[PDB]
Ligand binder design. Structure first.
Ligand SMILES: COC[C@H]1OC(=O)c2coc3c2[C@@]1(C)C1=C(C3=O)[C@@H]2CCC(=O)[C@@]2(C)C[C@H]1OC(C)=O
Lengths: 247, 1032
């Protein structure tokens, strides 16, 4: 008893394991852990959005943070600063040890695969398999989309170039259509107008080719926002298993 | 590398037209003539533009208005490329299928902007993989300033290249490939055992390409000048001649000749001792005779075309308050978002979360009210931060998101620099386009992500209002911060005692407690230690290597402390480049800190080591706040000083161009590099063409309904490679794996699609060097398209570094860190190691009996053959040595799921270790086969003397890497920036922190490792049954 089974004594756990337990947690959240070189113990206190590692020094059967080691049981030390402010150890730490982590949350597990089990561990795999599926389809679509966007830009430049070609052949035809009607020379005017009607028709073809791409793009854009919508539905449920599942 | 590591014991996707991978053998192309008419011409897909034009103007004479046409040569083609630009094609030698056309059409114009040259440097566009001129109208002044201000660096580099015209230009193009230290480790020196070496020197004689040689025996520490001098003395012996004439001859012709390695483009252009050249040292290692080619300087110098660097087209007092006069607390107004993508299944609501950050964060971050129907994202509220504005550190930034977690009883993110590249504190209305959340992340904020608005405007878009004070607010100058530091240092001694941890300056001798410089970069520091360190900051200037720890002790949200830190940093003793690199990762955003780091590098990094850690230094460019900084200046300058450095600088930057969070920064950088690199751009363009054809080729084979039987895919491959456009593109260019290797003509018969799952390309080039095959090699590379090759790359780098540490401690363990280069989004090249086979391939061969009968002794039997008696001892030693190396590196790095197809052996006994993929978990092998090769004896080989020596190499090697943990921690740390799944956060690096003991003693570590190893378990699969599926 005493230290070994206090709510806030986790001992076993590592540096990473604490950081997950103190994520976005209010100021005053704490746990005690075994030191990585076994004083023997480490306090991890939340202040200002950070996780403060404070050593507990064990010299001659007495505990504390610095050389006037007043306390003598660790539980005596930690409980002191549950009621008293930490400001009497370094003024900048005006906070109190307000919130334990508690190694009682929701079954003695982790001691003895599917054997030591099983229901919504398997549900995770399914939601995690689907999250994979969607995120893949999601990034493919995203890049698909980008390709179309640069294709639309390519069409715009293409059309612009073909538009210029009419503005080119009306500059050159206009002063030849009126030069050939001097010679009473038609049918030659017919060949000149044949090219005009190929070029004009070609512009409609390209313009339509783009428009077709445009209504495919906004359709994909709609499809993309949908993938995202479905993904943001699975994120805050995939984590709510991890919470129920592991601990 | 040189010899195939063979010891001599006896001594947005691409592709040809839009929507189509491969354009048909014949196609119709529309030609828009300048007289206004459109004529369709039937073209072969490999038709050059010269002949297409020739055809166009032939057939135009049949269409109306033919007389308004000028001569054939008065015009140039213009079209739209699938990158959406109007390209003018000046190189009419280019084939139709090579122009990256969007549509099969050309336009005929008269060359306007008549600066054929500036426009022609469209070669930059191609190398970069982006049209230069997308830059030309970006608008962001930071960008446009970067383009202008970085040209200085180009000018200096280009000048520092003509400082001594012919020689310094040679040095740039062919830099000495040399080790960092002249001093020669015992075991390597002892391979000479007189302190001298036998070298063969080759000369190509009068046009007959006849090859005389000269064998010289020379002191290993001779400069190239003196080897040449000894070559003169030899030749001159035969002619008799008087001494004095003999003496005058050497004296006046030494510096008239040049040494080249036979069979690759490496030169000995500098006065380093011979054995400091990586090739000579490697020769000693391999038990090879150095083959060098003797050559007149004039013949090298005459064939270095260079000169042209031109300054490009882009070469053209207000109200200012000081930041620390602003008397208010920091607040930021959150207006509204355009939209976020959630249905409303359950209105877990939307809120903007914000934080003020230094990578680690200067304050408690806050959310706005969950004021949301998701229908309308609107808050319109000022958020109040508990940090005084004057306390804001220079690299302060705001990191925000819109998200969700859930209450018992994500979404989109973005980062903003609170200061400009001009030191202006941001004020006024500001719109920010948000970024999609990274795959393996759910942290509400992502402060390690990039800074600035998402380029893609079709995204959620947050609107913010920053405070406006009477005028422009600026960060104070150093020449004012300094004054404030000195003032507050003067206040310290006037205090009475103080009862607060960040206390003092006598200084006691208990400060042996500052042997925590010895502790690794992720050892982490108690608050007591943070306060202890800061109290003694002045005694630290005597233990320079604590700087990173002290820096993590500083309160960055305190102007008083930060000012003092700048003072200390300003005249801090220099630290070894290894330690300086730590200071360029994400934990050290402050520009003063990084400036110090870059200054160490400018002073103590050899070009050798820069090459070794380039991968990391490129990555670290992403953590820089601003485009223009001292690290880009440093790297870019070295890249433009040393073409070997420059080459990989190019490919490391190019390989990430697809990544939009980095495109602009890297493209900009690449642009300045390409503009100033000189003639190598031409060689780079050849490499990019080659790679693009390969990418396009293996795309067809990978999707475009090509999943038929291997034989079918081989028919297609053989047809495509014979086509002239492919022949031209994939022959006669430098190897991106090592630019010193010329890749000549393909050997088509040797080129294959491998019949693995991944079916990569195996390509084979001739070596076009005069002294090649008969003295060096032919050239094999795997083209991998589909698998991310960055992990392999990193692993192979670490292996090379590991080998370095051991080899320089006189611990002779041989690794095989073969070439591997990622060149794009899951595209890469892998060096082929010749004369090697997988354990499996060996086991399957006869085993001097037949069929597929093996057993545990087969490996040893195979090596005993191949190294028939007397050379044998070497083979066993090489195997034992290399095996040890990989046994330890594998364990340290957590490279698991090894097996007999993962591990290869060479004819000479060397072992390695291919196809890495997975990293730190995300173990310990020793198969019985290997146990039997070490030793020779039967089932008893876990208690042989050979096994004990083997275990000793393992202990000694483990401890060596352990002693250099710090390098490795920092190397992995710098690599956190990229998109490696196995390296998303510091907690991933923790793995090697455990594998090497680190939080234990050397004595506890050795014991921990011993334990890991004396377990190990051994055995192996052997005909008996199920060596295929592994049943029992
Ligand atoms: C297990 O898949 C081996 C093999 O096939 C692959 O798809 C693959 C996945 O990365 C690699 C490979 C290959 C291509 C494999 C290389 C390698 O590392 C080796 C690296 C060193 C070397 O010589 C290579 C090229 C041989 C080669 O295998 C042979 C020929 O057995």
């Amino acid at each position: 008893m005493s230290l070994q089974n206090a709510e806030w004594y986790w001992g076993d756990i590592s540096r990473e394991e604490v950081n997950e337990k103190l994520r976005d947690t209010a100021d005053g959240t704490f746990l005690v852990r075994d030191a990585s070189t076994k004083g023997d113990y480490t306090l991890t206190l939340r202040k200002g959005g950070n996780n403060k590692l404070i050593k507990i020094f064990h010299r001659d059967g007495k505990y504390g943070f610095s050389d006037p080691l007043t306390f003598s049981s660790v539980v005596e030390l930690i409980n002191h600063y549950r009621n008293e402010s930490l400001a009497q150890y370094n003024p900048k730490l005006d906070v109190k040890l307000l919130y334990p982590v508690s190694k009682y949350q929701q079954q003695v597990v982790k001691e003895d695969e599917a054997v030591g089990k099983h229901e919504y561990n398997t549900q995770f795999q399914e939601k995690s398999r689907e999250y994979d599926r969607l995120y893949e389809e999601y990034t493919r679509t995203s890049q698909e989309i980008q390709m179309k966007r640069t294709a639309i830009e390519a069409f715009n430049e293409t059309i612009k170039i073909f538009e210029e070609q009419c503005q080119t052949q009306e500059r050159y035809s206009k002063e030849y259509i009126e030069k050939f009607k001097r010679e009473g020379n038609e049918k030659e005017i017919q060949r000149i107008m044949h090219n005009y009607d190929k070029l004009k028709s070609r512009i409609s073809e390209i313009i339509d080719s783009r428009r077709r791409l445009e209504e495919d793009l906004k359709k994909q854009a709609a499809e993309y926002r949908e993938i995202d919508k479905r993904m943001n539905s699975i994120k805050p449920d995939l984590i709510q298993l991890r919470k129920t599942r592991d601990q | 590398s040189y010899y195939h590591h063979h010891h001599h014991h006896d001594y947005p996707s691409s592709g040809e037209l839009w929507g189509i991978h491969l354009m048909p053998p014949r196609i119709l192309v529309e030609c828009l003539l300048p007289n206004g008419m459109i004529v369709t011409l039937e073209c072969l897909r490999e038709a050059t533009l010269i002949t297409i034009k020739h055809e166009l103007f032939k057939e135009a004479r049949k269409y109306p208005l033919h007389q308004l046409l000028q001569d054939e040569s008065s015009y140039i083609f213009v079209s739209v490329t699938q990158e959406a630009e109007r390209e003018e094609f000046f190189d009419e030698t280019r084939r139709l299928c090579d122009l990256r056309l969007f549509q099969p059409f050309l336009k005929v114009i008269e060359p306007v902007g008549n600066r054929e040259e500036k426009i022609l440097n469209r070669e930059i566009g191609f190398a970069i993989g982006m049209p230069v001129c997308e830059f030309d109208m970006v608008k962001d002044p930071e960008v446009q300033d970067f383009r202008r201000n970085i040209l200085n660096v180009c000018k200096e580099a280009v000048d520092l290249r003509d400082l001594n015209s012919p020689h310094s230009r040679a040095m740039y193009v062919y830099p000495p490939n040399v080790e960092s230290s002249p001093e020669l480790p015992k075991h390597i020196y002892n391979k000479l055992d007189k302190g001298q070496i036998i070298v063969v020197i080759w000369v190509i004689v009068s046009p007959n390409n006849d090859k005389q040689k000269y064998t010289l025996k020379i002191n290993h520490d001779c400069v190239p000048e003196q080897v040449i001098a000894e070559a003169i003395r030899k030749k001159t012996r035969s002619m008799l001649l008087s001494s004095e004439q003999l003496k005058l001859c050497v004296l006046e012709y030494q510096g008239k000749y040049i040494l080249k390695v036979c069979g690759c483009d490496e030169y000995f252009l500098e006065k380093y001792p011979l054995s400091q050249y990586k090739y000579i040292r490697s020769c000693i290692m391999l038990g090879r005779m150095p083959n060098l080619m003797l050559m007149a300087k004039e013949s090298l110098y005459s064939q270095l075309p260079m000169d042209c660097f031109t300054m490009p087209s882009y070469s053209r007092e207000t109200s200012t308050k000081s930041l620390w006069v602003i008397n208010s607390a920091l607040r930021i107004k959150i207006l509204c978002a355009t939209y976020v993508n959630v249905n409303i299944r359950d209105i877990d609501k939307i809120y903007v979360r914000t934080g003020i950050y230094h990578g680690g964060e200067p304050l408690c971050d806050n959310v706005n009210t969950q004021r949301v129907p998701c229908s309308n994202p609107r808050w319109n509220e000022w958020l109040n931060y508990d940090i005084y504005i004057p306390d804001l550190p220079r690299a302060a930034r705001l990191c925000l998101s819109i998200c969700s977690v859930k209450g018992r009883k994500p979404l989109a993110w973005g980062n903003i620099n609170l200061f400009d590249y001009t030191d202006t504190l941001v004020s006024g209305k500001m719109a920010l386009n948000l970024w999609p959340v990274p795959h393996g992340l759910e942290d509400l904020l992502n402060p390690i992500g990039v800074t600035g608005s998402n380029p893609n405007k079709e995204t959620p878009c947050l609107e913010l209002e920053f405070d406006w004070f009477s005028s422009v607010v600026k960060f104070p100058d150093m020449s004012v911060i300094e004054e404030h530091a000195n003032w507050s240092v003067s206040r310290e001694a006037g205090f009475s005692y103080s009862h607060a941890g960040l206390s003092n300056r006598r200084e006691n001798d208990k400060e042996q407690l500052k042997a925590i410089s010895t502790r690794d970069p992720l050892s982490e520091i108690t608050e007591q230690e943070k306060d202890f360190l800061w109290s003694h900051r002045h005694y630290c200037v005597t233990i320079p290597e604590i700087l990173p720890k002290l820096l993590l002790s500083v309160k960055w949200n305190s102007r008083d402390e930060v000012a003092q830190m700048y003072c200390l940093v300003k005249d801090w003793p220099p630290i070894k480049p290894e330690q300086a690199m730590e200071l360029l990762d994400c934990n050290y955003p402050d520009p003063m800190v990084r400036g110090f780091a870059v200054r160490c590098l400018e002073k103590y990094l050899t070009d050798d080591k820069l090459s070794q850690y380039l991968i990391q230094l490129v990555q670290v460019l992403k953590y820089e706040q601003y485009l223009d900084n001292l690290l880009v200046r440093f790297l870019l300058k070295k890249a433009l000083t040393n073409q070997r450095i420059g080459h990989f600088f190019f490919w490391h930057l190019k390989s990430e161009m697809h990544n939009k969070t980095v495109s602009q920064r890297f493209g900009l950088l690449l642009e300045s590099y390409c503009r100033a690199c000189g003639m190598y751009l031409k060689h780079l363009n050849r490499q990019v063409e080659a790679m693009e054809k390969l990418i396009n080729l293996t795309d067809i084979l990978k999707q475009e309904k090509k999943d038929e039987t291997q034989k079918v895919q081989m028919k297609f491959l053989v047809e495509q490679m014979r086509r002239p456009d492919f022949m031209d593109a994939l022959q006669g260019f430098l190897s991106p794996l090592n630019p010193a290797h010329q890749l000549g003509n393909l050997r088509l018969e040797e080129c294959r699609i491998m019949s693995s799952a991944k079916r990569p390309l195996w390509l084979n080039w001739e070596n076009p060097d005069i002294m090649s095959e008969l003295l060096f090699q032919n050239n094999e590379i795997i083209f991998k398209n589909g698998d991310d090759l960055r992990q392999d790359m990193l692993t192979l780098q670490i292996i090379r570094i590991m080998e370095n540490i051991w080899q320089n401690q006189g611990l002779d363990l041989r690794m095989l860190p073969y070439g591997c280069l990622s060149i794009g989004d899951c595209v890469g090249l892998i060096e082929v190691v010749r004369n090697s086979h997988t354990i499996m391939q060996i086991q399957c061969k006869g085993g001097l009996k037949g069929a597929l009968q093996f057993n545990s002794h087969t490996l040893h039997q195979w090596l005993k053959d191949k190294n028939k008696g007397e050379i044998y001892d070497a083979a066993i030693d090489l195997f034992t040595r290399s095996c040890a190396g990989y046994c330890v590196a594998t364990f340290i790095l957590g490279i698991g799921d090894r097996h007999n197809s993962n591990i290869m052996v060479k004819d000479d006994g060397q072992l390695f270790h291919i196809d890495f993929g997975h990293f730190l978990d995300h173990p310990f092998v020793l198969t019985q086969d290997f146990l039997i090769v070490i030793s020779k004896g039967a089932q008893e080989c876990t208690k042989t003397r050979e096994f004990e020596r083997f275990q000793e190499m393992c202990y000694k090697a483990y401890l060596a890497i352990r002693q250099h943990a710090n390098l490795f921690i920092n190397l992995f740390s710098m690599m956190l920036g990229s998109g490696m799944p196995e390296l998303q956060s510091f907690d991933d690096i923790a793995y090697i922190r455990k594998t090497l003991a680190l939080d234990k003693t050397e004595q506890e570590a050795l014991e921990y490792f011993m334990k890991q190893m004396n377990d190990a378990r051994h055995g192996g699969w052997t005909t008996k049954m199920d060596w295929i599926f592994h049943t029992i």
